[PDB]
Enzyme design. Structure first.
Site, PDB file in Angstrom:
ATOM      1  N   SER A  61       2.172  -0.869  15.915  1.00 38.40           N
ATOM      2  CA  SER A  61       1.514  -1.793  14.915  1.00 38.40           C
ATOM      3  C   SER A  61       0.636  -2.673  15.783  1.00 38.40           C
ATOM      4  CB  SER A  61       2.427  -2.123  14.079  1.00 38.40           C
ATOM      5  OG  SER A  61       2.740  -1.300  13.207  1.00 38.40           O
ATOM      6  N   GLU A  63     -12.868   1.351 -15.914  1.00 41.27           N
ATOM      7  CA  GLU A  63     -11.686   0.613 -15.680  1.00 41.27           C
ATOM      8  C   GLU A  63     -11.967  -0.453 -14.660  1.00 41.27           C
ATOM      9  OE1 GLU A  63      -8.003   2.014 -16.453  1.00 41.27           O
ATOM     10  OE2 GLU A  63      -9.290   2.419 -18.073  1.00 41.27           O
ATOM     11  N   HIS A  67       1.364   6.023  15.464  1.00 40.93           N
ATOM     12  CA  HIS A  67       2.403   6.430  16.337  1.00 40.93           C
ATOM     13  C   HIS A  67       2.135   6.242  17.987  1.00 40.93           C
ATOM     14  CE1 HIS A  67       6.124   8.166  17.808  1.00 40.93           C
ATOM     15  NE2 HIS A  67       6.729   7.373  16.814  1.00 40.93           N
ATOM     16  N   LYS A  86      13.499  -4.830   4.532  1.00 44.82           N
ATOM     17  CA  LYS A  86      12.359  -5.820   3.993  1.00 44.82           C
ATOM     18  C   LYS A  86      11.407  -4.921   3.283  1.00 44.82           C
ATOM     19  CE  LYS A  86       9.003  -9.052   5.670  1.00 44.82           C
ATOM     20  NZ  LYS A  86       8.043  -9.760   6.795  1.00 44.82           N
ATOM     21  N   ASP A  87      11.411  -3.515   3.620  1.00 42.50           N
ATOM     22  CA  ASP A  87      10.533  -2.795   2.864  1.00 42.50           C
ATOM     23  C   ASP A  87      10.996  -2.301   1.338  1.00 42.50           C
ATOM     24  OD1 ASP A  87       8.434  -2.776   4.686  1.00 42.50           O
ATOM     25  OD2 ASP A  87       8.750  -0.765   5.170  1.00 42.50           O
TER      26      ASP A  87
HETATM   27  C1  HEM Z   1      -3.156   6.935   0.364  1.00 44.53           C
HETATM   28  C2  HEM Z   1      -3.333   5.774   1.206  1.00 44.53           C
HETATM   29  C3  HEM Z   1      -2.664   5.268   2.407  1.00 44.53           C
HETATM   30  C4  HEM Z   1      -1.370   5.326   2.776  1.00 44.53           C
HETATM   31  C5  HEM Z   1      -0.062   6.081   2.024  1.00 44.53           C
HETATM   32  C6  HEM Z   1      -1.154   4.420   3.900  1.00 44.53           C
HETATM   33  C7  HEM Z   1      -0.316   4.352   4.726  1.00 44.53           C
HETATM   34  C8  HEM Z   1      -0.053   3.367   5.848  1.00 44.53           C
HETATM   35  C9  HEM Z   1       1.385   3.044   6.540  1.00 44.53           C
HETATM   36  C10 HEM Z   1       2.607   3.440   6.218  1.00 44.53           C
HETATM   37  C11 HEM Z   1       0.943   2.221   7.518  1.00 44.53           C
HETATM   38  C12 HEM Z   1       1.752   1.522   8.473  1.00 44.53           C
HETATM   39  C13 HEM Z   1       2.550   0.170   7.878  1.00 44.53           C
HETATM   40  C14 HEM Z   1       1.568  -0.727   7.443  1.00 44.53           C
HETATM   41  O1  HEM Z   1       0.952  -1.429   8.423  1.00 44.53           O
HETATM   42  O2  HEM Z   1       1.324  -1.221   6.315  1.00 44.53           O
HETATM   43  C15 HEM Z   1      -0.590   2.069   7.596  1.00 44.53           C
HETATM   44  C16 HEM Z   1      -1.175   1.330   8.476  1.00 44.53           C
HETATM   45  C17 HEM Z   1      -2.506   1.383   8.547  1.00 44.53           C
HETATM   46  N1  HEM Z   1      -3.646   1.737   7.695  1.00 44.53           N
HETATM   47 FE1  HEM Z   1      -3.216   2.810   5.797  1.00 44.53          FE
HETATM   48  N2  HEM Z   1      -2.610   4.014   4.490  1.00 44.53           N
HETATM   49  C18 HEM Z   1      -3.249   4.350   3.184  1.00 44.53           C
HETATM   50  C19 HEM Z   1      -4.626   4.134   3.129  1.00 44.53           C
HETATM   51  C20 HEM Z   1      -5.394   3.319   4.082  1.00 44.53           C
HETATM   52  C21 HEM Z   1      -6.992   2.926   4.092  1.00 44.53           C
HETATM   53  C22 HEM Z   1      -7.627   3.170   2.872  1.00 44.53           C
HETATM   54  C23 HEM Z   1      -7.252   2.313   5.327  1.00 44.53           C
HETATM   55  C24 HEM Z   1      -8.407   1.789   5.850  1.00 44.53           C
HETATM   56  C25 HEM Z   1      -9.767   1.831   5.346  1.00 44.53           C
HETATM   57  C26 HEM Z   1      -5.991   2.443   6.222  1.00 44.53           C
HETATM   58  C27 HEM Z   1      -5.912   1.756   7.413  1.00 44.53           C
HETATM   59  C28 HEM Z   1      -4.725   1.751   8.285  1.00 44.53           C
HETATM   60  C29 HEM Z   1      -4.536   0.931   9.269  1.00 44.53           C
HETATM   61  C30 HEM Z   1      -5.826   0.516  10.275  1.00 44.53           C
HETATM   62  C31 HEM Z   1      -3.398   0.591   9.558  1.00 44.53           C
HETATM   63  C32 HEM Z   1      -2.695   0.003  10.929  1.00 44.53           C
HETATM   64  C33 HEM Z   1      -2.682  -1.492  10.650  1.00 44.53           C
HETATM   65  C34 HEM Z   1      -2.212  -2.622  11.661  1.00 44.53           C
HETATM   66  O3  HEM Z   1      -0.854  -2.061  12.274  1.00 44.53           O
HETATM   67  O4  HEM Z   1      -2.325  -3.477  11.728  1.00 44.53           O
HETATM   68  N3  HEM Z   1      -5.012   2.993   5.536  1.00 44.53           N
HETATM   69  N4  HEM Z   1      -0.969   2.873   6.601  1.00 44.53           N
HETATM   70  C1  LIG Z   2     -11.659   5.683 -14.608  1.00 46.33           C
HETATM   71  O1  LIG Z   2     -12.806   6.466 -14.592  1.00 46.33           O
HETATM   72  C2  LIG Z   2     -13.845   5.714 -14.775  1.00 46.33           C
HETATM   73  O2  LIG Z   2     -13.853   4.428 -14.783  1.00 46.33           O
HETATM   74  N1  LIG Z   2     -15.082   6.230 -15.220  1.00 46.33           N
HETATM   75  O3  LIG Z   2     -15.237   7.602 -15.034  1.00 46.33           O
HETATM   76  C3  LIG Z   2     -14.662   8.539 -16.054  1.00 46.33           C
HETATM   77  C4  LIG Z   2     -16.155   5.705 -15.838  1.00 46.33           C
HETATM   78  C5  LIG Z   2     -16.332   5.353 -17.042  1.00 46.33           C
HETATM   79  C6  LIG Z   2     -17.168   4.942 -17.578  1.00 46.33           C
HETATM   80  C7  LIG Z   2     -18.325   4.418 -16.945  1.00 46.33           C
HETATM   81  C8  LIG Z   2     -18.307   4.681 -15.846  1.00 46.33           C
HETATM   82  C9  LIG Z   2     -17.214   5.156 -15.034  1.00 46.33           C
HETATM   83  C10 LIG Z   2     -17.222   5.701 -13.655  1.00 46.33           C
HETATM   84  O4  LIG Z   2     -17.968   4.492 -12.919  1.00 46.33           O
HETATM   85  C11 LIG Z   2     -17.834   4.598 -11.598  1.00 46.33           C
HETATM   86  C12 LIG Z   2     -18.789   3.860 -10.827  1.00 46.33           C
HETATM   87  C13 LIG Z   2     -18.512   4.201  -9.441  1.00 46.33           C
HETATM   88  N2  LIG Z   2     -17.793   5.487  -9.690  1.00 46.33           N
HETATM   89  C14 LIG Z   2     -17.179   6.332  -8.650  1.00 46.33           C
HETATM   90  C15 LIG Z   2     -16.659   7.443  -8.831  1.00 46.33           C
HETATM   91  C16 LIG Z   2     -16.112   8.062  -7.774  1.00 46.33           C
HETATM   92  C17 LIG Z   2     -16.655   7.610  -6.520  1.00 46.33           C
HETATM   93 CL1  LIG Z   2     -15.694   8.827  -5.325  1.00 46.33          CL
HETATM   94  C18 LIG Z   2     -17.020   6.564  -6.164  1.00 46.33           C
HETATM   95  C19 LIG Z   2     -17.465   5.877  -7.143  1.00 46.33           C
HETATM   96  N3  LIG Z   2     -17.408   5.674 -10.787  1.00 46.33           N
END
Ligand code: HEM
Ligand SMILES: COC(=O)N(OC)c1ccccc1COc1ccn(-c2ccc(Cl)cc2)n1
Ligand SMILES: CCCCCCCCCCCCCCCCCC(=O)OC[C@H](COP(=O)([O-])OCC(O)COP(=O)([O-])OC[C@@H](COC(=O)CCCCCCCCCCCCCCCCC)OC(=O)CCCCCCCCCCCCCCCCC)OC(=O)CCCCCCCCCCCCCCCCC
Ligand SMILES: CCCCCCCCCCCCCCCCCC(=O)OC[C@H](COP(=O)([O-])OCC(O)COP(=O)([O-])OC[C@@H](COC(=O)CCCCCCCCCCCCCCCCC)OC(=O)CCCCCCCCCCCCCCCCC)OC(=O)CCCCCCCCCCCCCCCCC
Ligand SMILES: CCCCCCCCCCCCCCCCCC(=O)OC[C@H](COP(=O)([O-])OCC(O)COP(=O)([O-])OC[C@@H](COC(=O)CCCCCCCCCCCCCCCCC)OC(=O)CCCCCCCCCCCCCCCCC)OC(=O)CCCCCCCCCCCCCCCCC
Ligand SMILES: CCCCCCCC/C=C\CCCCCCCC(=O)OC[C@H](COP(=O)(O)OCCN)OC(=O)CCCCCCC/C=C\CCCCCCCC
Ligand code: HEC
Ligand code: HEM
Ligand code: HEM
Ligand code: HEM
Lengths: 49, 79, 142, 49, 49, 49, 106, 62, 378, 54
Positions: I204, I270, I200, I226-227
């Protein structure tokens, strides 16, 4: 000057009942503003799921 | 402090708009849309597609050499 | 399990209430193993309790063939041949694994008919608001 | 290109700050074993058994 | 007048032979346009009912 | 330990996307478990209920 | 700085200018720069006619991308007509930052 | 310039947005019991003679 | 006197969702942030049901889950909503990260770093939910983590014994895995409010990589409608996988119960962990394999430091677009290799693809941006 | 350049607990509002244990 400013032509976007620039759009407006409008109303009977 | 009256400085720009009830929501759809989505496909096809072709060739070589290393033995199977 | 595998030469035949959900063939695997018995081929010297089944992991199931022509006769009258025996027990053991089968597919039909109404109607509502920006024109007069 | 560490005036950066830290790289060998229930430094002294 | 929202406003009734314009005009600073449009449209709706 | 034989695809009467099970072929197949088997297999999760 | 590849390496520069497509949106090269702190000081130092030209060219390109459209080919920005209007103002802002940094360590 | 039949009831119910606030409740019918035409008549047609209420007269009043 | 601009609670909602300035050329790739917020809420109102009827012990875990699909009313629909709803969360997370990598959104440094924390927390949560049903894949997948977790040279042998309930496979193993799985989804909900508060401050990014302060529109009604449309298309795909093929994403061998009875025909997790299992399996050392597992996710934090281009996004960078899709095709290879047995062609392939994943991010991407800088005469 | 007045998360804490204007003659009867916040947190980190073995 500001009298060199006019609206550009919008003919390839208008609804088919307002392309005529001379009819005064009395009854072709309330019988026009309904196209995307039970679209909005029959949406919200489907949200009853 | 990011609200609409305080964003940036702008001069000499004019915009024209129509009401949504005065226009049709579906203009040219297959007249303009089909030639538009085809040159968008042409503009990005040489960047995205050649990586996924090399995954396909490695996948076929990897599953076919797995079988004739295992129990597929025509002629190397003698005394 | 002490007395189980002693009755079957060192093997416990497993439970069957989830057996088609637990194998990589569904109910096609159970059918293809009940009716797929062969004789042990040239060189395969199997021990005391091994009958050669080619649809088994290890080719050496400890299972004499359980079903043949008329081990049973049905209640309304049906020719009880071996494939007919196996086809009906593999329509069993799938309902047992998945007793939600017919309720899953009838609920999936009302889902596809309601989202065939909601989706083109939300999309044209989105199309109505966004037409202001799609039709706008710009001019620069310095 | 993090050459802000490489300067002829801020060599005394590390000479006013390390006389704090004469024990501070070994406070885990003084302080964490107060709660680990190990015997890391408990053999060093006849102070504690 | 209480909030110092504008410099002036006026309402007009322009008539031609078959049509016309019915509305309002106002002058204000750059941070007051949204509030003045909100209060003016609320007075039109308070006369329809 | 060398290869394995995988089962072919049989055209079951419940194979389709909107296809039910045949409720006469479950009755005939219950007795292939009841009176031809249960000499080796338990099925500890289904009842007579 | 090779005299034998004087025309050949200008062929790869002209090819890369067309493979990148900011000229199809009617943009100049200095319109597309990432605005860090040195770039934001150079924009503030521009004269008033070059500032207003840049603001309109960016707004017209954002409006084209919203519609997923490009300009007609006779309105594309040519390669030997692209003016590097921001590069003299940016080289001076960076030289002033590097002067304040040699002073802080000597 | 005669219009089409898109002046549905726009002058009658839909102008003052009194309809729009309560279409979850008031304008909510015609789409449960009028859709007996829908899935259940289709689902039993693909599965004719396979559900239980098809094989039912064979096993009562015997 | 406008109540949505002056009420203390209503003005927080108005600045966040209604009157928020937004770029006008935002694409459908910006839809997946609110989709992640729908998938997280759905996994909370469905994990309510499962933990109600649950018992976690070495003697009854495999039967406590089979009780719900048959006996517990509306339990087959809610169980497979939960198992496929977690596959939906992971596909909406990989699209989301790849968006911000492609368009240079990592330059929002504080928002990007809280995101990397969010990627670790949902990955560790879902690992401690697949161990709960106690089948063959639950056992042999958990017992390859602790081989690399006891490889920690000092504290590791008392670390695994403290989380296994006290000895080994026993009754109380699934009282610390189940505790670390009920409470971790709520740290994610608090880390998501902080994640949006940092966004914020700037607003964006947009697909061109150029600031858009001259072309903002309000968030309502343009991106609220749109969302909502994009979320309706997500519920259609999720209910199709639940009501027409609820076992398509899964393994049949996890219906065979857990016991140290016999070695399984294979070991595989998985689909959303198959890229990570393929990397550690191609390292013949239980300390080198646990370091490259953590180095495959925490490498995202170096993305602000490795940036050498004068432009922000990849829209005008054709040589960098080729390298981005080579990285996506490299993660498809690792997902396939991680479900294959450890044999002759799948060790030389699975260990060269583990090398190329690190060579693209660290070496090939910073050099190629410099080459493109020289070709544009800066 | 004071970090507790300009950081987006730290300035919420500063306005709520640190720089908040408060009356100078507040008695001990105004202590029981933060005591209710201690009792609610304690009933959460203890109801964790009981619902585990239940
Ligand atoms: C539970 C996980 C997450 C939630 C609920 C979440 C939620 C959101 C929301 C609502 C936005 C604004 C709308 C959008 O641009 O899509 C956003 C933007 C963003 N998120 Fe996430 N996010 C999550 C995970 C992550 C992860 C894993 C990353 C990166 C490693 C990340 C990085 C960013 C960035 C950089 C933006 C801004 C992007 C832009 O404006 O171009 N977020 N997130
Ligand atoms: C849905 O669960 C599975 O797929 N699990 O675990 C019961 C499973 C089942 C059979 C064999 C292997 C796994 C797990 O294999 C892996 C490989 C990498 N991660 C891992 C887990 C946590 C974090 Cl932070 C980072 C990496 N786990
Ligand atoms: C929201 C809806 C999704 C919600 C449901 C959740 C479902 C999740 C999911 O399954 O993935 C869907 C998601 C769909 O992506 P999307 O957000 O709808 O598409 C983004 C738009 O293309 C975004 O538009 P775009 O601009 O990025 O278009 C991409 C590109 C490419 O252009 C095209 O190729 C044409 C785009 C229109 C496609 C129409 C196809 C017609 C046939 O267009 C361009 O080249 C223009 C860029 C600028 C170039 C200059 C040209 C001027 C214009 O992921 C997929 O890509 C498909 C995977 C589906 C299965 C997932 C499992 C993977 C294995
Ligand atoms: C941590 C996060 C906790 C949140 C988790 C859920 C807990 C929900 C919660 O916090 O409840 C807060 C609760 C309601 O929160 P909310 O409903 O979720 O949304 C906040 C609204 O701004 C609250 O609306 P309001 O109180 O500002 O309304 C002012 C007033 C003025 O409204 C009007 O007369 C119409 C003006 C147009 C309103 C347009 C609003 C913009 C949309 O409304 C009325 O006169 C009648 C209310 C109309 C029906 C209510 C449904 C509409 C919402 O707020 C209060 O308890 C207000 C204090 C009431 C004390 C009254 C003392 C004077 C007597
Ligand atoms: C270029 C690469 C990134 C550069 C890093 C700096 C910007 C990123 C950042 O500030 O995130 C901090 C944070 C790490 O920084 P730090 O160790 O906490 O503080 C030292 C820095 O100088 C950061 O110190 P500071 O200048 O930000 O001092 C204010 C600090 C202190 O303010 C507070 O955190 C208030 C404490 C919260 C109290 C309420 C607790 C509720 C329970 O505020 C924060 O650090 C909050 C940002 C992280 C949110 C975590 C708070 C949980 C909610 O980022 C992360 O969350 C993990 C990423 C770690 C690797 C990134 C840096 C290595 C490259
Ligand atoms: C890992 C397991 C697998 C994860 C899921 C993999 C998902 C499959 C991805 C296939 C989707 C293909 C999208 C097709 C659309 C397309 O490519 O068109 C090109 C189009 C051109 O548009 P512009 O760049 O804006 O204009 C430039 C003009 N030169 O490019 C784009 O759309 C930009 C791409 C946005 C990224 C969105 C996410 C892409 C998915 C890649 C997954 C990578 C995951 C990486 C995260 C790893 C986390 C540990
Ligand atoms: C001759 C005694 C016997 C009969 C009767 C019998 N089985 Fe078996 N079967 C066995 C034994 C013993 C095993 C376990 C072999 C092992 O684990 O090595 C087995 C294994 C199986 C398996 C598992 C095969 C695999 O690949 O693991 C299935 C499925 C099966 N039986 C189904 C049936 C069905 C259905 C019937 C009723 C028609 C039946 N069996 C009757 C002896 C029998
Ligand atoms: C980020 C959110 C969540 C994710 C990614 C997630 C993931 C998973 C996974 C992968 C399973 C295994 C299902 C199976 O293999 O059949 C599962 C089941 C389970 N989850 Fe969650 N879950 C989440 C939220 C929750 C919540 C909020 C709770 C508790 C209130 C919870 C408690 C459980 C329990 C007890 C099970 C076992 C029941 C079963 O296996 O069907 N989970 N979850
Ligand atoms: C879980 C329950 C509650 C919590 C955590 C809580 C918390 C607090 C806190 C921290 C304060 C400020 C410090 C103080 O003056 O003590 C406060 C003040 C106040 N509370 Fe509560 N409270 C709770 C219940 C209640 C109840 C039940 C009432 C009344 C019916 C109430 C009414 C008030 C009022 C009127 C004040 C301001 C008093 C003043 O400044 O003179 N609160 N509360
Ligand atoms: C406002 C907070 C709370 C209040 C006022 C409260 C009150 C109580 C009371 C009166 C009992 C009965 C003890 C007895 O009669 O021996 C109890 C126990 C119990 N509580 Fe809570 N509690 C609170 C928080 C919680 C939480 C956060 C949980 C769950 C996470 C929880 C779950 C339980 C359970 C399962 C018992 C079992 C009976 C026992 O162990 O004695 N409660 N609590």
């Amino acid at each position: 000057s500001h009298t060199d400013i006019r609206v550009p032509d919008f003919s390839d976007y208008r609804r088919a009942e307002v392309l005529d620039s001379t009819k005064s759009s009395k009854e072709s407006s309330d019988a026009r503003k309904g196209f995307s409008y039970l679209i909005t109303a029959t949406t919200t009977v489907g949200v009853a799921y | 402090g990011r609200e609409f009256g305080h964003l940036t400085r702008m001069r000499h720009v004019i915009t024209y708009s129509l009401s949504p009830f005065e226009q049709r929501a579906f203009p040219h759809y297959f007249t303009k849309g089909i030639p538009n989505v085809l040159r968008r496909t042409r503009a990005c096809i040489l960047r995205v597609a050649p990586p996924f072709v090399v995954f396909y060739l490695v996948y076929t070589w990897g599953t076919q050499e797995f079988e004739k290393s295992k129990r597929k033995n025509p002629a190397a199977y003698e005394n | 399990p002490e007395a189980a595998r002693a009755a079957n030469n060192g093997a416990l035949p497993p439970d069957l209430s989830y057996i088609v959900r637990a194998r990589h063939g569904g109910e096609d695997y159970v059918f293809s193993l009940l009716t797929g018995y062969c004789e042990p081929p040239t060189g395969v010297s199997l021990r005391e309790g091994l009958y050669f089944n080619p649809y088994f992991p290890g080719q050496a199931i400890a299972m004499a063939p359980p079903i043949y022509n008329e081990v049973l006769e049905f209640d309304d009258g049906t020719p009880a041949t071996m494939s007919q025996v196996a086809k009906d027990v593999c329509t069993f053991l799938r309902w047992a694994s998945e007793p939600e089968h017919d309720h899953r597919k009838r609920m999936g039909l009302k889902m596809l008919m309601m989202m065939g109404l909601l989706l083109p109607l939300v999309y044209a509502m989105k199309r109505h608001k966004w037409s202001v920006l799609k039709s706008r024109k710009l001019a620069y007069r310095p | 290109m993090l050459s802000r560490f490489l300067g002829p005036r801020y060599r005394e950066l590390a000479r006013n700050w390390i006389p704090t830290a004469s024990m501070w790289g070994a406070v885990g060998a003084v302080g964490l074993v107060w709660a680990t229930d190990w015997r890391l430094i408990l053999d060093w002294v006849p102070y504690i058994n | 007048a209480t909030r110092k929202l504008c410099q002036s406003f006026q309402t007009f009734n322009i008539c031609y032979a078959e049509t016309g314009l019915l509305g309002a005009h106002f002058v204000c600073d750059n941070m007051s346009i949204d509030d003045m449009m909100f209060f003016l449209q609320g007075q039109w709706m308070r006369l329809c009912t | 330990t060398d290869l394995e034989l995988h089962a072919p695809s049989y055209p079951w009467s419940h194979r389709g996307l909107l296809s039910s099970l045949d409720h006469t072929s479950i009755r005939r197949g219950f007795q292939v478990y009841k009176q031809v088997c249960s000499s080796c297999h338990s099925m500890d999760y289904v009842a007579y209920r | 700085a090779v005299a034998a590849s004087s025309k050949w390496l200008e062929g790869i520069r002209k090819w890369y200018y067309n493979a990148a497509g900011f000229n199809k949106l009617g943009l100049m090269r200095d319109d597309t720069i990432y605005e860090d702190d040195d770039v934001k000081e150079a924009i503030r130092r521009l004269p008033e006619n070059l500032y207003n030209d840049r603001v309109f060219r960016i707004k017209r390109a954002l409006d084209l991308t919203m519609r997923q459209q490009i300009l007609p080919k006779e309105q594309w920005t040519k390669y030997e007509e692209d003016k590097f209007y921001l590069e003299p103002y940016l080289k001076e802002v960076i030289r002033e930052r590097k002067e304040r940094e040699e002073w802080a360590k000597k | 310039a005669a219009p089409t039949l898109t002046a549905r009831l726009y002058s009658l119910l839909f102008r003052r947005t009194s309809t729009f606030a309560l279409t979850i409740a008031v304008g909510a019918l015609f789409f449960e019991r009028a859709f007996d035409q829908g899935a259940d008549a289709i689902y039993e047609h693909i599965n004719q003679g396979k559900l239980w209420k098809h094989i039912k007269h064979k096993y009562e009043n015997k | 006197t406008n109540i949505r601009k002056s009420h203390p609670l209503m003005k927080i909602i108005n600045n966040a969702f209604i009157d928020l300035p937004a770029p006008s050329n935002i694409s459908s790739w910006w839809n997946f942030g609110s989709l992640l917020g729908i998938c997280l809420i759905l996994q909370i109102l469905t994990g309510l049901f499962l933990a109600m009827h649950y018992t976690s012990d070495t003697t009854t875990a495999f039967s406590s889950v089979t009780h719900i699909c048959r006996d517990v009313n509306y339990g087959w629909v809610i169980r497979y909503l939960h198992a496929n709803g977690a596959s939906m969360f992971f596909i909406c997370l990989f699209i989301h990260v790849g968006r911000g990598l492609y368009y240079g959104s990592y330059m929002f440094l504080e928002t990007w770093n809280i995101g990397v924390v969010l990627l670790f927390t949902v990955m560790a949560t879902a690992f401690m939910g697949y161990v709960l049903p106690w089948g063959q894949m639950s056992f042999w997948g958990a017992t390859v983590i602790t081989n690399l977790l006891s490889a920690i040279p000092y504290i590791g042998t008392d670390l695994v014994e403290w989380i296994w309930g006290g000895f080994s496979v026993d009754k109380a193993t699934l009282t610390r895995f189940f505790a670390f799985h009920f409470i971790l989804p709520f740290i994610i909900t608090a880390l998501a409010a902080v994640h949006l508060l940092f966004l914020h401050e700037t607003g964006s990014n947009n697909p061109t990589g150029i600031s858009s302060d001259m072309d903002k529109i309000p968030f309502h009604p343009y991106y609220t409608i749109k969302d909502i449309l994009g979320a309706l298309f997500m519920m259609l795909i999720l209910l199709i996988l639940v009501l027409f093929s609820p076992d398509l994403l899964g393994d049949p061998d996890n219906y065979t119960p857990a016991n140290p009875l016999n070695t399984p025909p294979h070991i595989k997790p998985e689909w959303y962990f198959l890229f990570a299992y393929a990397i550690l399996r191609s390292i013949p050392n239980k300390l080198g394999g646990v370091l490259a597992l953590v180095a495959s996710i925490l490498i995202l934090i170096l993305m602000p430091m490795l940036h050498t281009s004068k432009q922000r996004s990849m829209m005008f960078r054709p040589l960098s677009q080729c390298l981005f899709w080579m990285l996506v095709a490299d993660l498809i290879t690792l997902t396939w290799i991680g479900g294959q047995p450890v044999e002759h062609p799948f060790i030389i392939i699975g260990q060269l693809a583990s090398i190329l994943y690190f060579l693209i991010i660290l070496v090939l991407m910073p050099i190629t941006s410099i080459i493109e800088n020289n070709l544009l005469k800066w």
